[PDB]
Structure formats: structure tokens, C-alpha cells
Ligand binder design. Structure first.
Ligand SMILES: Nc1nc2c(ncn2[C@@H]2O[C@H](COP(=O)(O)OP(=O)(O)OP(=O)(O)O)[C@@H](O)[C@H]2O)c(=O)[nH]1
Ligand SMILES: [Mg+2]
Ligand code: NA
Lengths: 162, 185
């Protein structure tokens, strides 16, 4: 059972930190991804082929070229960053409304919960404007990519829907 | 489609495996000095005689003869170097199609990978010893075709925003770059 995961989100969201937390079991020092990172992570008898593409505004047009055959979307969000939460909403809805991301289940990592001023999942859900999305299988999972909190909870939901 | 790109490089496969793939010059610069990588395709194509130390691209060739040419020109003096056979992925751009007329060195026919090339994308490697290339291809057991067989290089259209001409270059005044031109250009 191989599930193709596409992990997207704005820069500094913690995507690569999550990828290699799952892959290596440890949070590593990262570099702003301008290209892509791809790793296969196994969990509960499900080979997660996870794609991590960079979230800098300039290379976001490249996201679209990774849509084909994507069975799951992981949108990572920085919850301490309220300046770009609106920017995160627009991009999320730009991804999921694409022709080739129609059938994708959507896991949202409300990342960076360890930070004190971070927004809670019930605020992130609203601020990401997916409160009235009943059409799509989504779920917002609070997480801390550096500690690993919430990651395998999110994958458990992903597994149950695949 | 599943065509391939070729890159001449003086780093042996064991070093490339430990690196995680063919990474850009700016990556090791970032972790050492904190210098943010330069994703301006124009700066990448220009260079400065060698590659820039903050460069965030990895150059490739379209053919084996061209990659060999890079090896016998740019890697001249090196006793041993490798020509890495690479699969196409959407972080790669055709330089001459992105920079158009203003491509600094069109004879390179360079296809540059933004952010470097993972190890799973490297099909294999030839070995060039003393200019001689008489050894057959060594297959990479780490290569993952399933990843890239259905992925092509990025269209020039997507690359225009990453051209990175100087703010006052005449290319930002013209098609098609004007559509991605930074304020004032
Ligand atoms: N406090 C805190 N920091 C985090 C968390 N997750 C990631 N970070 C940090 O935030 C920074 C950005 O992490 P990245 O994984 O590089 O973010 P990214 O989404 O890959 O960024 P791009 O490659 O540009 O798209 C890093 O310094 C991480 O250590 C978290 O859960 N809590
Ligand atoms: Mg990253
Ligand atoms: Na390909």
C-alpha cells in the first residue's frame, strides 16, 4: 500500500523539518528548499512517498508540476506567523482546487505549537478558511516538528483515510 | 517522459552519496557562513572565472558528448572525473530558453537544477580517467525511477521569474520577462 504524499506550504513552515523527523526520527538543521526533497517513510504498513517542495513565492508556480498521482496533501502552517496566515490560506485553496488535486485527502499540520504566541488549531482551521469545506476529507493536526508532537497522529488520520 | 541529463563532476559517487546527491555550491556555503543561496539563473549562467560560492543551481548537459565536453574543458587538469546520468525533475530549467537572447553562454545548452539533485534521481555514472571514457555505465542502486519517470523539467515559462537579471537589465523591459519583472525594472 503506497500512498503518494505532496507536502506543500509557505517557506519557513517546517515542511523539511517534518519530512526528516519522520524519515530519520530526528529534527535536523534545514536549508530553505528552493528545489525539492523526496523520501519514502513507512508507517503502519503504508509506504508514504512524501514530496517536499520549497515554499518561496518564486518557486510556488513549480508546485503544480508535482500534482499528478498525488493521493494526499500535507499543508504545513507556521502558527506563530500571523502576518502570512492569509497568504497560507490563499495558497492552500490554490492547491486543492487544481484539477489534479481534486481527489486528494488534506492533512493540515498546525505546526509550531511549542511557541507561546502560536495560534491554536481551532483558529488555524478558521484562518485557513476551511470551516465550511464539507466536500473534502481534511483534518487540522496541531504539531511541533522539532519535538515530533502530532506528526504520527496526523499520519494515523492519513492512514485511516487510505 | 523519461529522457535524461548528464553532468560532468570531479566529485566521486561515494562523496555524492554521502552528500545526499549533487548539491549546489551555495548549500555548503549556507551551513558554513549563513550565506543565503543565489537563485538568480542569470548569475548562475554568468559565473565568474568557476561557479559562484552561493550558487543555488546545479548545471547539467543534454547529451553525453556535451557533458564530456564540459569534462574536457571545465574539468581539464583533473585526473579523474565522473559524468553523472540524471533523470529529469520539475526543479530543472533550460537556461537558454529562460534567459533567451541574454543567455551569457548559449553554447553550454545547459539544463540547471534549482536546489540541487537528490541521489535517487541519479541513474548512474561513467568514469573518465585521463580523458578516456572506455568504461560502461555503473548503475545506481539508489536510483528511483518511479519518482521521476512521470516528471519533466520545468517549462521556461516558470523559469522566467527566476531569471534574476539585474534590476536595471533591459530584459525586464521586454517579453516575456516584463511579466515577472521586479518593481521599477
Ligand atoms: N519552534 C519551532 N520551530 C520549527 C518547527 N518546525 C520547524 N521549525 C523551524 O522553522 C524553520 C523552517 O523549517 P523548514 O523545514 O526549513 O521550513 P520549510 O517549509 O521546509 O521552508 P521552505 O523550504 O522554504 O519551504 C527551521 O529553522 C525549523 O527548525 C516547530 O514545530 N517549532
Ligand atoms: Mg524546506
Ligand atoms: Na523524468
Amino acid at each position: 500500500k503506497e500512498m503518494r504524499i505532496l507536502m506543500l506550504g509557505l517557506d519557513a513552515a517546517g515542511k523539511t523539518t517534518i519530512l526528516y523527523k519522520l524519515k530519520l526520527g530526528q529534527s535536523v538543521t534545514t536549508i530553505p528548499t528552493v528545489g525539492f526533497n523526496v523520501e519514502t517513510v513507512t508507517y503502519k504498513n503504508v509506504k508514504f512517498n512524501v514530496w517536499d517542495v520549497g515554499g518561496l513565492d518564486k518557486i510556488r508556480p513549480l508546485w503544480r508540476h508535482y500534482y499528478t498521482g498525488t493521493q494526499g496533501l500535507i499543508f504545513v502552517v507556521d502558527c506563530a506567523d500571523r502576518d502570512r496566515i492569509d497568504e497560507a490560506r490563499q495558497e492552500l485553496h490554490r492547491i486543492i482546487n487544481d484539477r489534479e488535486m481534486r481527489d486528494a485527502i488534506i492533512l493540515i499540520f498546525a505546526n509550531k505549537q511549542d511557541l507561546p504566541d502560536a495560534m491554536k488549531p481551532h483558529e488555524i482551521q478558521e484562518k485557513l478558511g476551511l470551516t465550511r469545506i464539507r466536500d473534502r476529507n481534511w483534518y487540522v493536526q496541531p504539531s511541533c516538528a522539532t519535538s515530533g508532537d502530532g506528526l504520527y497522529e496526523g499520519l494515523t488520520w492519513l492512514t485511516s483515510n487510505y | 517522459n523519461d529522457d535524461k541529463l548528464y553532468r560532468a563532476d570531479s566529485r566521486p559517487p561515494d562523496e555524492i552519496k554521502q552528500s545526499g546527491g549533487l548539491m549546489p555550491r551555495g548549500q555548503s556555503e549556507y551551513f558554513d557562513r549563513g550565506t543565503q543561496m543565489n537563485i538568480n539563473l542569470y548569475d548562475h549562467a554568468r559565473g565568474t572565472q568557476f561557479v559562484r560560492h552561493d550558487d543555488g543551481y546545479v548545471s547539467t548537459s543534454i547529451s553525453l558528448r556535451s557533458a564530456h565536453l564540459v569534462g574536457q574543458t571545465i574539468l581539464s587538469g583533473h585526473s579523474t572525473y565522473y559524468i553523472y546520468v540524471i533523470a529529469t525533475a520539475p526543479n530543472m530549467f533550460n537556461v537558454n530558453d529562460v534567459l533567451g537572447a541574454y543567455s551569457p553562454h548559449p553554447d553550454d545548452q545547459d539544463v540547471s537544477a534549482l536546489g540541487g539533485i537528490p541521489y535517487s534521481q541519479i541513474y548512474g555514472w561513467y568514469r573518465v580517467h585521463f580523458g578516456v571514457l572506455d568504461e560502461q555505465l555503473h548503475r545506481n542502486r539508489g536510483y528511483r525511477d518511479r519518482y521521476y519517470s512521470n516528471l519533466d523539467i520545468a517549462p521556461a515559462a516558470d523559469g522566467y521569474g527566476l531569471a534574476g537579471f539585474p534590476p536595471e537589465h533591459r530584459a525586464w523591459r521586454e517579453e516575456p520577462w516584463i511579466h515577472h519583472a521586479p518593481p521599477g525594472s
